[PDB]
Amino acid sequence: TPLSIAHPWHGPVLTRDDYESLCCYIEITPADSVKFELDKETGILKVDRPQKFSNFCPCLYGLLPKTYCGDLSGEYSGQQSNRENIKGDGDPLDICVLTEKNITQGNILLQARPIGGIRILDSEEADDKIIAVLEDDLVYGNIEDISECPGTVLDMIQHYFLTYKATPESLIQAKPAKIEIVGLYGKKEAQKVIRLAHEDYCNLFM
Amino acid sequence: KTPLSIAHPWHGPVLTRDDYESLCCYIEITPADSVKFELDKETGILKVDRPQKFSNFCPCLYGLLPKTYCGDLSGEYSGQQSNRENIKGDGDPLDICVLTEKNITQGNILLQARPIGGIRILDSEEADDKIIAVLEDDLVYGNIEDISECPGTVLDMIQHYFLTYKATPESLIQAKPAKIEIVGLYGKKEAQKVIRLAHEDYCNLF
Amino acid sequence: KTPLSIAHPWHGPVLTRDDYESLCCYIEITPADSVKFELDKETGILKVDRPQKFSNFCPCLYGLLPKTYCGDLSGEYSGQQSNRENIKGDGDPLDICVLTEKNITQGNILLQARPIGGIRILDSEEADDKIIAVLEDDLVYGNIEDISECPGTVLDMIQHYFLTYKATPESLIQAKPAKIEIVGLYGKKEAQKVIRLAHEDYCNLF
Ligand code: NA
Ligand code: NA
Ligand code: NA
């Protein structure tokens, strides 16, 4: 009998069907004007910072329980991008959940099925974003691979990370992007990226 | 004596302190939601069960009663009250609909409400009672004491929700019989007994 | 080291890490709310205290400061600073109003805020101080260091709230004297002292 609410990062079971579907903790929705992040110490959702510019997060954004972007995650990202000395960013694995429904509040769990991801390198750190579709979603529910995902939605998501920290001076001066989008990958690779981040988590917290 | 962690919303709060005249309730779904939320029993975190399949919103505050379980005693009584055999409990905490004039947009909250009645529902030989209660000190519903004093238009809205939120168009076009059976409504005293029985089911199981 | 459960918002989080230059705050009420929420001390779950009685919304992010307690030391300083005797603490955590330009619709969150002052309020010999703070990195209020740099229209808005949210029409038509006493405002250093004392009250209580 669970007497207390479990920490969203350590509590939930990540997967029960060998990563075909995942339990996800949502931190940010399109409705938010600030960036929320799960407070590691307390397990309470916390304001990280207000949105600096004119962006909203264009999907449900959160973390995967029982994942940690660590040694194995960094090495695979480095291998997959032909890069050496790539380390993990030290946080849980980021996931973007596609849904046609309106969710206005974060601090929730949901079931989502991975279809791919965006491999991002941010100054020698792997900052992968898993892309998943909400289970039984009326629009995205039957998408099984990222190649079946509307390219306009992927561009929206890439645009968010490319601009949400870009100063006007940097955009007018055409300064190169501070994050490197190495490209997209599909379901199987995403499941591998999740598998590795889970092993990183298991070794450090279990 | 100092709670260092947040209590599980199902097991933690005290159900009643005044012999079921008012109840502490945990809210999972509001009229503002477009998905059906449900408390994850294992973790105590609010979780998306499924998106709304059709064109319904939940027309009230919907949630559960702490320290209740729809078990053996609940099933036998529901069968007794509907004169139907082999009626079992649905295995979940007891459902409650809270009437309020105010706009509540987020779930994952507690509130105090007063029961005034309930809807006896059978879903394929399972008791799926919905307790009807009024938010304490609500400016419109606060003084309502029995379901007979509740506006019938609001009760029809609530009955319509459960009669349609899982009804496919084909089943409606072919006039297939409803998959849930509304056996009728009951008043305050009967509602308090259903809560009492569901509370005993919980105590015997834990 | 693995926090398995979500921490109680009042007892769990660390109040300050920079000697009260910035504070961790737990938000109970936002401008979007139509009811008054309050952290339930026993369970640590956000709970509806009562609906808004009249035509008010809370004009800022409103909550409590973790690990604070408005006790004896808090009352004595309030009495000294207001030249009134026998002022006791109100027994709750220290209240805080957070100013932000952004729209936050959901409570039950943590955030970092920098105090700039506060409102000293006496409610029938009880200190009901309201700390005034600005959301860290807020695009508008972020650089405000003292309450004297805060627009008086915002302060009037906050004072108007506490002066009217419990004022019946009859009491206003008959111009009956206010039930709460606004003794005045204070600046950054003094607010830090009020928080320091309230933190000491809490530590001495446990
Ligand atoms: Na990351
Ligand atoms: Na049920
Ligand atoms: Na107070």
Helix (H, G, I), strand (E, B) or coil at B49: strand
Q: Give dist(CA B37, CA A108) in Å, integer.
A: 9
H-run or E-run covering B183:
strand B181-186
A101 Cβ under 8 Å from any chain B Cβ:
yes
Q: Which residues contact A188 (CB under 8 A, 6 or more apart)?
A: none
In sequence order, the 6+-apart residues with CB closer than 8 A to the CB of C33 are C57, C58, C107
Ligand 1: distance of its center to the CA of A168 in Å? 24
Chain C, residues 179-198, CB within 8 A of chain B, namely none
Locate the chain A residue with the closest alpha carbon to C24.
Answer: A46
Burial class (CB in 10 A: 0-12, 13-18, 19+), A12: buried
Relative to beta strand C126-127, strand C88-89 is parallel
**CA nearest to A98, candidates A43, A49, A35, A140:** A140
- Read off φ and ψ for residue B14, nearest 5 degrees: -80, 125
- Backbone φ, ψ for residue C85 (5° rounding): -95, 160
* Interchain contact, C108 vs A104, CB within 8 Å: no
C112 contacts in A (CB within 8 Å)?
A: 47
Structure tokens at B8: 């599980």
Q: A36 to chain C: which residues are within 8 Å by CB?
A: 109
B104 three-state secondary structure: coil
C-alpha separations of B141 from A157, B133, C151 in Å: 45, 9, 40
Ligand nearest to the CA of B130: 2
In 3D space, the residue among B159, B109, B161, B163 whose CA is nearest the CA of residue B135 turns out to be B109
Q: Is C84 annotated as a binding residue?
A: no
Instruction: Specify the 3-state DSSP secondary structure of B194.
Output: helix
Q: Which residue is closest to C27 within chain A, CA to CA? A: A46
CB within 8 A of A36, min separation 6: which ones?
A27, A28, A45, A46, A47, A48, A106, C109
Q: What sign does the CA torsion over C192, C197, C200, C202 have?
A: negative
Residue entry with tokens 């320290």? B67
Q: For residue C47, which of B131, B14, A28 has the smallest C-alpha distance?
A: B14
Interchain proximity A42–C139, CB inside 8 Å: no
At residue A147's C-alpha, the angle toward residues A142 and A151, to 5°, is 100
Ligand in closest contact with the CA of A67: 1
Q: How far, in Å, CA of A198 to CA of A76, rounded?
A: 13
- Reference A130, options A74, A193, A87; nearest CA is A193
**H helix or E strand, kind and range, residue B182:** strand B181-186
What's the Cα-to-Cα distance from C59 to each of A30, A102, C56, rounded to whole Å? 23, 26, 8
Hunting for tokens 């943590």 — which residue is that?
Answer: C110
* Rounded distance between C-alpha atoms, residue C175 and residue C157, angstroms: 20
DSSP labels, chain C: ----BPBPTTTSS-S-SSTTSSEEEEEEE-TT-SEEEEE-TTT--EEEEEE--SS----SEEEE-TT----HHHHHHHHHHHT-SS-EE-SSPPEEEEE-SS-----SEEEEEEEEEEEEEESSSEE--EEEEEETT-TTTTT--SGGGS-HHHHHHHHHHHHHTT--HHHHHTTPPPSSEEEEEE-HHHHHHHHHHHHHHHHHH-
Mutate to test the interface with A, among C2, C4, C6, C17 (most CBs of A within 10 A): C6
Maximum distance among all Cα pairs of chain C, rounded to whole angstroms: 61
Find out whether A187 and A143 touch, Cβ atoms under 8 Å: no
Element (H, E) at B169: helix B169-173
Other CB atoms within a 10 A radius of the CB of residue B205 amount to 10
Cα–Cα distance for residue pair B79/B67, rounded to 1 Å: 22
Of C3, C101, C112, the CB nearest to A41: C3
**CA dihedral sign of residues C29, C31, C32, C33:** positive
CA–centroid distance, residue A36 to ligand 1 (Å): 13
Would you call B179 helix, strand, or coil by DSSP?
Answer: coil
Tell me the C-alpha distance between C45 and C42, whole Å: 8
Residue B31's closest CA among B82, B75, B97? B97
From the list A83, A167, A153, the residue with the least C-alpha distance to A120 is A83
Q: How many A/B residue pairs have CB atoms within 8 Å? A: 85
Three-state secondary structure call for residue B135: strand
Decide the pairing of beta strands C61-64 and C46-51: unpaired
Give residue A204's identity as a one-letter amino acid code: L
Q: Which domains, ranges and CATH numbers included, belong to chain A?
A: 1-206 (3.90.80.10)
* Rounded Cα distance, B113 and C35, in Å: 14
Q: What is the 3-state secondary structure (H, E, C) of B22-46?
A: CEEEEEEECCCCCEEEEECCCCCCE
Q: Which sign does the torsion angle of CA A139, A145, A147, A151 carry? A: positive
C-alpha distance from residue C112 to each of A38, B72, C14, C155 (Å): 13, 49, 11, 20
Q: Which 3-state string (H, E, C) describes chain A? A: CCCECECCCCCCCCCCCCCCCEEEEEEECCCCCEEEEECCCCCCEEEEEECCCCCCCCCEEEECCCCCCCHHHHHHHHHHCCCCCCEECCCCCEEEEECCCCCCCCCEEEEEEEEEEEEEECCCEECCEEEEEECCCCCCCCCCCHHHCCHHHHHHHHHHHHHCCCCHHHHHCCCCCCCEEEEEEEHHHHHHHHHHHHHHHHHHHC
- Please give the C-alpha separations between residue A185 and each of A191, C42, C60, C104, C181, in angstroms, as whole numbers: 10, 47, 44, 34, 63
Q: What amino acid is encoded at B116 in this protein?
A: I
CB within 8 Å: C42 and B105: no
Q: Tokens 């027309």 identify what position? A: B59
Nearest CA in chain B to C35: B102
